[PDB]
Design a protein around this nucleic acid. Sequence first.
RNA 1: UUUGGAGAGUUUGAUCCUGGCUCAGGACGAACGCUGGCGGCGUGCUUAACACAUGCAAGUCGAACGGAAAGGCCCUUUCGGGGGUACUCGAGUGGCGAACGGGUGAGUAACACGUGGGUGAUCUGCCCUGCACUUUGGGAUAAGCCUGGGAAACUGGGUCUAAUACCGAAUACACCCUGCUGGUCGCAUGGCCUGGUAGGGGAAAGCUUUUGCGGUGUGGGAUGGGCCCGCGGCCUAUCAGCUUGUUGGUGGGGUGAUGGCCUACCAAGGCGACGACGGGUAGCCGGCCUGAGAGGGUGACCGGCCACACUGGGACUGAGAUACGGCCCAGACUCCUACGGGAGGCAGCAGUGGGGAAUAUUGCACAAUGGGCGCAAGCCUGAUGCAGCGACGCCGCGUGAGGGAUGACGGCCUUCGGGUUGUAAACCUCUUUCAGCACAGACGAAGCGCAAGUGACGGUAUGUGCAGAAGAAGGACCGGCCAACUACGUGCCAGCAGCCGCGGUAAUACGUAGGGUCCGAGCGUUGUCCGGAAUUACUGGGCGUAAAGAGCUCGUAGGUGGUUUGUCGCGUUGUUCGUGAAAACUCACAGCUUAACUGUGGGCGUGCGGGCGAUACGGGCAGACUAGAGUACUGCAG
Lengths: 96, 200
Amino acid sequence: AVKIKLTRLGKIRNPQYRIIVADARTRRDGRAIEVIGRYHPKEEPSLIQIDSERAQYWLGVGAQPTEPVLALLKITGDWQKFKGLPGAEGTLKVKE
Amino acid sequence: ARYTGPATRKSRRLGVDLVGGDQSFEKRPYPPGQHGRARIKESEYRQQLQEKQKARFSYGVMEKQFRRYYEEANRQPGKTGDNLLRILESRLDNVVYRAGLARTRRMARQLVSHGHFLVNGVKVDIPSYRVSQYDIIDVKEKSLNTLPFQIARETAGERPIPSWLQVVGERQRILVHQLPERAQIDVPLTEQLIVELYSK
RNA sequence: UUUGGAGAGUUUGAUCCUGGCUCAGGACGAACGCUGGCGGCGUGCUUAACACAUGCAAGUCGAACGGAAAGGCCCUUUCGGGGGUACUCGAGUGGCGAACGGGUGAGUAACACGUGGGUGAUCUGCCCUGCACUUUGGGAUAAGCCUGGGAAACUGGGUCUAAUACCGAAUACACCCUGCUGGUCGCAUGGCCUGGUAGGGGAAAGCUUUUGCGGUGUGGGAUGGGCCCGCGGCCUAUCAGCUUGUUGGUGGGGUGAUGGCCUACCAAGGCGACGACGGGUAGCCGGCCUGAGAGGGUGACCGGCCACACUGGGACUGAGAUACGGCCCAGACUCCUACGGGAGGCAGCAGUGGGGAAUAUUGCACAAUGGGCGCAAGCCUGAUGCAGCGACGCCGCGUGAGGGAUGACGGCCUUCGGGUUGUAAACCUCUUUCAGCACAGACGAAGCGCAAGUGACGGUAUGUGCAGAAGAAGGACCGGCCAACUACGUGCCAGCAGCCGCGGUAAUACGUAGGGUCCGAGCGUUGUCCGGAAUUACUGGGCGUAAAGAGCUCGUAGGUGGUUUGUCGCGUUGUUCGUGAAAACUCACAGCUUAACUGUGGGCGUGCGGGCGAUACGGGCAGACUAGAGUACUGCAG
Ligand SMILES: [Mg+2]
Ligand SMILES: [Mg+2]
Ligand SMILES: [Mg+2]
Ligand SMILES: [Mg+2]
Ligand SMILES: [Mg+2]
Ligand SMILES: [Mg+2]
Ligand SMILES: [Mg+2]
Ligand SMILES: [Mg+2]
Ligand SMILES: [Mg+2]
Ligand SMILES: [Mg+2]
Ligand SMILES: [Mg+2]
Ligand SMILES: [Mg+2]
Ligand SMILES: [Mg+2]
Ligand SMILES: [Mg+2]
Ligand SMILES: [Mg+2]
Ligand SMILES: [Mg+2]
Ligand SMILES: [Mg+2]
Ligand SMILES: [Mg+2]
Ligand SMILES: [Mg+2]
Ligand SMILES: [Mg+2]
Ligand SMILES: [Mg+2]
Ligand SMILES: [Mg+2]
Ligand SMILES: [Mg+2]
Ligand SMILES: [Mg+2]
Ligand SMILES: [Mg+2]
Ligand SMILES: [Mg+2]
Ligand SMILES: [Mg+2]
Ligand SMILES: [Mg+2]
Ligand SMILES: [Mg+2]
Ligand SMILES: [Mg+2]
Ligand SMILES: [Mg+2]
Ligand SMILES: [Mg+2]
Ligand SMILES: [Mg+2]
Ligand SMILES: [Mg+2]
Ligand SMILES: [Mg+2]
Ligand SMILES: [Mg+2]
Ligand SMILES: [Mg+2]
Ligand SMILES: [Mg+2]
Ligand SMILES: [Mg+2]
Ligand SMILES: [Mg+2]
Ligand SMILES: [Mg+2]
Ligand SMILES: [Mg+2]
Ligand SMILES: [Mg+2]
Ligand SMILES: [Mg+2]
Ligand SMILES: [Mg+2]
Ligand SMILES: [Mg+2]
Ligand SMILES: [Mg+2]
Ligand SMILES: [Mg+2]
Ligand SMILES: [Mg+2]
Ligand SMILES: [Mg+2]
Ligand SMILES: [Mg+2]
Ligand SMILES: [Mg+2]
Ligand SMILES: [Mg+2]
Ligand SMILES: [Mg+2]
Ligand SMILES: [Mg+2]
Ligand SMILES: [Mg+2]
Ligand SMILES: [Mg+2]
Ligand SMILES: [Mg+2]
Ligand SMILES: [Mg+2]
Ligand SMILES: [Mg+2]
Ligand SMILES: [Mg+2]
Ligand SMILES: [Mg+2]
Ligand SMILES: [Mg+2]
Ligand SMILES: [Mg+2]
Ligand SMILES: [Mg+2]
Ligand SMILES: [Mg+2]
Ligand SMILES: [Mg+2]
Ligand SMILES: [Mg+2]
Ligand SMILES: [Mg+2]
Ligand SMILES: [Mg+2]
Ligand SMILES: [Mg+2]
Ligand SMILES: [Mg+2]
Ligand SMILES: [Mg+2]
Ligand SMILES: [Mg+2]
Ligand SMILES: [Mg+2]
Ligand SMILES: [Mg+2]
Ligand SMILES: [Mg+2]
Ligand SMILES: [Mg+2]
Ligand SMILES: [Mg+2]
Ligand SMILES: [Mg+2]
Ligand SMILES: [Mg+2]
Ligand SMILES: [Mg+2]
Ligand SMILES: [Mg+2]
Ligand SMILES: [Mg+2]
Ligand SMILES: [Mg+2]
Ligand SMILES: [Mg+2]
Ligand SMILES: [Mg+2]
């Protein structure tokens, strides 16, 4: 069961997270199949980016995201587009 | 960390004025010490280091800082000397000095460190700030009310404003437009010696 | 069509060459010596893979069962307690996790690693999704009760209980096997078209009444694996033969899959001078440093694999084992004992002893994110976020100023005229960063809950006020290489030193003073690596004398070929689609006030895979001639 992981990189006082589709049982920073987005909350707005096409393809083929990934891609609007209940909404706030 | 010792030592020992208004240098051009008149053998390395130390003790930069400017200037594709001259002049201290708002590099640096300046409406207190093309420099009311700033801004009759720098009004707004060329910059000394010394 | 290469001193009376050494540069997981202020961001046992005091690092389900030891309620009460309740639950069955996450580099020269495909030869729980069913019978055990051994761990004997614990039987007709009959593909058995055909065989368990999950099988996808190979990458003949399941075939067993993986029977060879077998060292790679490049050195951190868990072995379980905190046995060490016997494996996070030059705190949380369980709520997670220590490193900031004399003390020299420290200083004014004292005070969370809230960090980061230049600088060098000199004190003594080299009474080289130079919260010493070293010379060296032509021939293996007369294109370039994980380097953009830091999208990602298009050189192959060579005829001198 491949899951959407967030791979830790970098150094200590700033955590790193990479939205990568891979097998679940592997290491937290384990083998990466494809890199689709990156996550880092230390910055003030904590901007989030996901490749919509690849995310939709992975959800269709059967990658199961963790609840935080689901929530974040709902903020992005990928979940909204995939389920089709509200539509495709864009509300993300851009850097000043 | 900044050199707290006398500033006239650099000019006296080294043999060319730096501030430009040194009466001691013109009174006695020879280096201080009991034996400043002794004849000294010519050396390419003496003169190469001489140009370096003139530059660094004139602009007040750090050694690691200046070496970082050197490697930066090398890695831009443009000409190394012009790139180094821009990357050194882009220091906000030198910019605000040559704009006429400061009497000397040291005083510009001290005022910037204390933070009397605003950059595009954003608080800035860093003497080594980087100014890119088409930037805006602002001066706050707490500093317009400051007495030495008023003295500088109504005594600014120093060297003429350059091409890339220009003031627009009493608020002392400093604007930058383009990259100057060496010919109109007409800065003293010669970057070839410094670039060759670090090429060693 | 664009980017980037420095030398100097030192042999001689003197120079030129060759040749050696040393120095100026960058970097470290560094250390010692003096000094020392804060804040942010990294880093942290390289030796002893040595033994380890104590506590933590792996748990969850009453909506599975029997039950109620400890909490709640309700009837009771003599306050000893007696009944139901399932809210809740100790312990017991039964599942799920436990092979996840973290650690170290001893062995390993190997398909162990990277790249490149692969599987007509495999399997795969938990996820999603198109498509049948889920009928029935039986018995027992833990738990509990009684009892024994025994300090203890732990065990036996008797009685007894339920289940999603256990086992039959009913279907399956779409699968799994064996015998008979077609089309496609080639890459060969044979695969595919679920080929057709006759016979044989094959599984389930229910719960909840709610955003519903389960059981057995494989036409389709994806992940995960296992296996085989072209190619690559240390030194050493003062290591020349190695091997006997060894090599090959056939028949059997074996494993998920083919296979000397194992056995039997047949034959004698395979590997070997285009370095086998031996000996020493060592985890490999993207990367790091140096160098213009080639190249050399190296494997810090991170990340992709590899191998191990005190030493050596072995096996069960499972879709998945070198099974680290699983099992069994043998060793060494430690510990408890009531002497009858038992318990262990910090190379998990911290910490202690020893080695060392030395490397941290027995700190706070699931707030964010990954991981496990569960319908969810929720639980756990030294993974992780954070804080504390240490100038060890890439990076930013602070110890102030403007003016002030032909230049006030005092020191050091003097030629006794004076010159030095010096705009330095005392002075008159300024803003007072950061520490100090107060107030406000975040984001990090369109996140989770049908609840009313949820931030360890932190009451920090960050803004707003208060007082005062008030709290803040040292280290090396000063003979030439190499920017920086005079005096004072002992003279072949005491001593310096990277090369030359410096003191035998008047040292710019020793020690002290001043003075100046370099660097700076770091300054030098020490050790390792590259460059200069074209000093291992492919680019890019020589062999007359400095180091070198073996004593010289014949000649095997290899390396290299005198003209033009002919295909296939195996040395090769001819263009295109097709890989180059992530990360790093280089270019531009953008954000943290700029600083490290990181936020987004490119670009980069210098090698290797297949389909399509070329034939001038550089090879084999498919035919002819002769300028090298040889023979043939006549002479020749020795
Ligand atoms: Mg792991
Ligand atoms: Mg936001
Ligand atoms: Mg959650
Ligand atoms: Mg250089
Ligand atoms: Mg360049
Ligand atoms: Mg010599
Ligand atoms: Mg000689
Ligand atoms: Mg000599
Ligand atoms: Mg700090
Ligand atoms: Mg730290
Ligand atoms: Mg313990
Ligand atoms: Mg459970
Ligand atoms: Mg219970
Ligand atoms: Mg399991
Ligand atoms: Mg396990
Ligand atoms: Mg495990
Ligand atoms: Mg480690
Ligand atoms: Mg270790
Ligand atoms: Mg090893
Ligand atoms: Mg080997
Ligand atoms: Mg499974
Ligand atoms: Mg049944
Ligand atoms: Mg029983
Ligand atoms: Mg019954
Ligand atoms: Mg049956
Ligand atoms: Mg049947
Ligand atoms: Mg039948
Ligand atoms: Mg059919
Ligand atoms: Mg059953
Ligand atoms: Mg279940
Ligand atoms: Mg292969
Ligand atoms: Mg290879
Ligand atoms: Mg066989
Ligand atoms: Mg066979
Ligand atoms: Mg075999
Ligand atoms: Mg056999
Ligand atoms: Mg490489
Ligand atoms: Mg090079
Ligand atoms: Mg080289
Ligand atoms: Mg290596
Ligand atoms: Mg990794
Ligand atoms: Mg692999
Ligand atoms: Mg072992
Ligand atoms: Mg072992
Ligand atoms: Mg084992
Ligand atoms: Mg363990
Ligand atoms: Mg353990
Ligand atoms: Mg152990
Ligand atoms: Mg640990
Ligand atoms: Mg020790
Ligand atoms: Mg340390
Ligand atoms: Mg979590
Ligand atoms: Mg809910
Ligand atoms: Mg717990
Ligand atoms: Mg807990
Ligand atoms: Mg931390
Ligand atoms: Mg220290
Ligand atoms: Mg200290
Ligand atoms: Mg700093
Ligand atoms: Mg002043
Ligand atoms: Mg403040
Ligand atoms: Mg908030
Ligand atoms: Mg909000
Ligand atoms: Mg601030
Ligand atoms: Mg000198
Ligand atoms: Mg000098
Ligand atoms: Mg003397
Ligand atoms: Mg000095
Ligand atoms: Mg070197
Ligand atoms: Mg050549
Ligand atoms: Mg050579
Ligand atoms: Mg010779
Ligand atoms: Mg010879
Ligand atoms: Mg000989
Ligand atoms: Mg031949
Ligand atoms: Mg070809
Ligand atoms: Mg092609
Ligand atoms: Mg290609
Ligand atoms: Mg990428
Ligand atoms: Mg570079
Ligand atoms: Mg910005
Ligand atoms: Mg990039
Ligand atoms: Mg390269
Ligand atoms: Mg040939
Ligand atoms: Mg002929
Ligand atoms: Mg002939
Ligand atoms: Mg004759």
